[PDB]
Amino acid sequence: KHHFDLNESVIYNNVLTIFELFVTFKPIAEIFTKIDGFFADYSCKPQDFERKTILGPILSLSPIEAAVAIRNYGDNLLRSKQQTAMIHESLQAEHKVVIDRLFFIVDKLVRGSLNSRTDMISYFAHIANKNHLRRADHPPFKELSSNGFMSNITLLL
Amino acid sequence: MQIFVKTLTGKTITLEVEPSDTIENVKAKIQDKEGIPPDQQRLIFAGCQLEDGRTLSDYNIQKESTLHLVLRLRGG
Amino acid sequence: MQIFVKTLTGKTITLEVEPSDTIENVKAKIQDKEGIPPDQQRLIFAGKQLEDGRTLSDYNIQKESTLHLVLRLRGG
Amino acid sequence: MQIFVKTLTGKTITLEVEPSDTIENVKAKIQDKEGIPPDQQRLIFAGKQLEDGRTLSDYNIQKESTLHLVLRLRGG
Amino acid sequence: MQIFVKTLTGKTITLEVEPSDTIENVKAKIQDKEGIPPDQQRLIFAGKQLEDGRTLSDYNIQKESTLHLVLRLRGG
Amino acid sequence: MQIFVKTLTGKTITLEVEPSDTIENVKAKIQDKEGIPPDQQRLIFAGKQLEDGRTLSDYNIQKESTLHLVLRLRGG
Amino acid sequence: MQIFVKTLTGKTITLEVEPSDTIENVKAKIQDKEGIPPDQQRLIFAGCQLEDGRTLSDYNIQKESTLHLVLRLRGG
Amino acid sequence: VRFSQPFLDISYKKIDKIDANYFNNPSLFIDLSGETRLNSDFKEADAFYDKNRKSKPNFISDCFFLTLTYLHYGLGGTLSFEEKMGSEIKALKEEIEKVKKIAANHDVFARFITAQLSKMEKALKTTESLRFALQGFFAHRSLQLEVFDFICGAST
Amino acid sequence: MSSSKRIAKELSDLERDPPTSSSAGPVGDDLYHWQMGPADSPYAGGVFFLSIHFPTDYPFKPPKISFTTKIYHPNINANGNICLDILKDQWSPALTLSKVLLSISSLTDANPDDPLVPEIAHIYKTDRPKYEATAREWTKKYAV
């Protein structure tokens, strides 16, 4: 409540660092996986895994988000190959940085504890099996998880 | 047994079917795997349409046969 | 009236009829063993066609004359 | 002595039980709320299926032992 | 004073109580006279579920009246 | 079993029955004259109800006992 | 004979109907006078809906009776 | 409607000019399909057509009834047609602040949204124009006076 | 002049002979404002709260009755309307409130020709298993 996109380069870095301190401590990791709001609802809306769980607000960051691209490439609609390649080479480095930063999270998350790694596997699997509608010719995009999110988690795991 | 079907874009979603099952019976197993209401369920086999109420064994559709999930002028 | 009938592969049955009966009633002694639906009631007689709806006096079914039963695959 | 069991979609549930309860009895205590066919009984403890004929006692089931309700076994 | 309490089986028991007694007291008497747990007990009078914190005089319960007792809970 | 029947206005018919029959079979001799559909098969017997689906041994139809046939106006 | 029906705005379009005619039979005489496809044809009489296949004489709708052309949450 | 007032004279002398038996024969120019009747059914209507079994052409009588027919199917339809317009004006204004109460802080989606209400304010000014224009010519007392004169004469 | 004298006796008939699976009487103090799912039915485990308002002509008119507990039945909507053919066709003056409660207890047997909720009526027509499952679902949901 208080549009968590990748535009505000002075927010998401702080949000990531907020988890960065917790993830370091081994006693924190072994029990971080069993908290309130970690799992989403049992019958949660597929488009509601974005804003109704723990991780969903932090790893959903990806350049594919509509407004970021509207601001960058939609500003200069008739840009040539080099002009858009400028946006690419500008944003891909930030993308690589965030990917590596949150992989550091998930590594200790898996290396938290036995129940921790079981919980993370279950948490991914549950989001997966509720997205089979993605493979249709005209899938219900408004009823499915944003492809930025389900694509980010792919090369992450 | 199992049979095949393909859309315009080339995707090949298989689905188990039974000789007793009618065309609407199999089309009921379509929106589950593609999210398509049967109001637009349009089936062509061997260039000929299929009757709505008729059963699977009404078109001699053997095992490992082929369907063609085509669409009418509906949607959009 | 004993009229023989044989399928494509060579299997045959022994069935009884009456001279003034109908081919569907003769067919009614074809679904007694296998249970062949009337929609597939195909009769072949020496390069011609025998419609199901007519009678035995119109099909000139003689004594111990073998007819041809072939599974119908209608549709078009 | 109630036990927990989770489905493929993960519906946590409770069911009071006894050491002598047979596995099929436990399954019969499931379709009350889930409406599952008991013939497709498939219960998973410690990565093992539960021998339906036996009871819970031959398994080292303890207080609030977790189970997995994976009984699709489909089908269609 | 004596009143009538009916369980789900239709079993009628006469309970000799006083109007000043609370419904909790009545449920304790029921558990003493049959062993049935009081948390499962659901008393019905003229289509009204009663409260253990309240007494018989509160709901105009006269003697020789009929009370319907309802049980619940199962094997999970 | 001669059982009389009379409608609201006082018109009556003379019909035959058997002691082991069913009320719908008794009704089958009620649509012989008017052609009354079975959906309107209403029987009235001394302030009670007589469902159509039962038999004459359950309706205790005595000898020359008049029943009541009233047009049904169901709906709701 | 002729019967009545009214919309939400109060207009009273009459239309001849026949006792044999079904509810869809009369509703087929609706889009002609108001241009409403029977997909939304919703009829209420005396607060009770009418079954689709049911005929006119299935609701004792006498001459000079009243219908109520109401609409569902469809259209727009 | 102008052809009516001569035979609808305030002296009321041309009453016999319009035949009251004009609906004895079947129609000649006006439609009766779906034409509900006053206190008779089609079953009596078709029989009574024949029951007379005989037809003198006259423009006047045809024009008189065509006048009422166009009255009902015409501006009679128009008044109800605009009867929902006043509700439609409130409906259009209902979303006017609904799409403005949102955070309008986009780069080009904001420009598209502003173009989405640049036409909407013209739409409001047009719906209000229609609502305040249909009302005035209804308030054109001369025209309505003529119409009401025709109503009175036809009733007579 | 005539109205009240029937209600008191029809009510005291409860004390004279209590019913099997029901209980009646005034909901509060009003005379005209009066207040158990069958085992062989998915309603089992359900006991119901009822709203009753006798009309001024109750001895000569059927009393309208409403539900307070939601149910899943074809002949019942959310407004508790009862498709009892007695009340609107042959609600004789001699029919007791107890007899009316008995006819209600007959609702159990569903009438398919009176599809107050046709969505549930077709399910009763072919989908009895899920019908009985959902009836118990709502039984445990509302009619505790």
Coordinates of C-alpha atoms in Angstrom, one line a residue, chain A residues 132-140, chain B residues 7-9 11 31-35:
Chain A
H132 CA -1.0 -24.5 -15.8
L133 CA -3.3 -22.0 -17.6
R134 CA -0.2 -20.2 -18.8
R135 CA 0.2 -22.6 -21.7
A136 CA -3.0 -21.6 -23.6
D137 CA -3.2 -19.7 -26.8
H138 CA -5.0 -16.9 -24.9
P139 CA -4.4 -17.5 -21.2
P140 CA -6.2 -15.5 -18.5
Chain B
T7 CA -4.8 -25.7 -32.3
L8 CA -3.8 -23.1 -34.9
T9 CA -0.5 -22.3 -33.2
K11 CA 0.3 -26.9 -29.6
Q31 CA -11.6 -25.9 -20.7
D32 CA -9.8 -27.7 -17.9
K33 CA -6.5 -27.8 -19.9
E34 CA -6.9 -24.7 -22.1
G35 CA -9.7 -22.6 -20.4

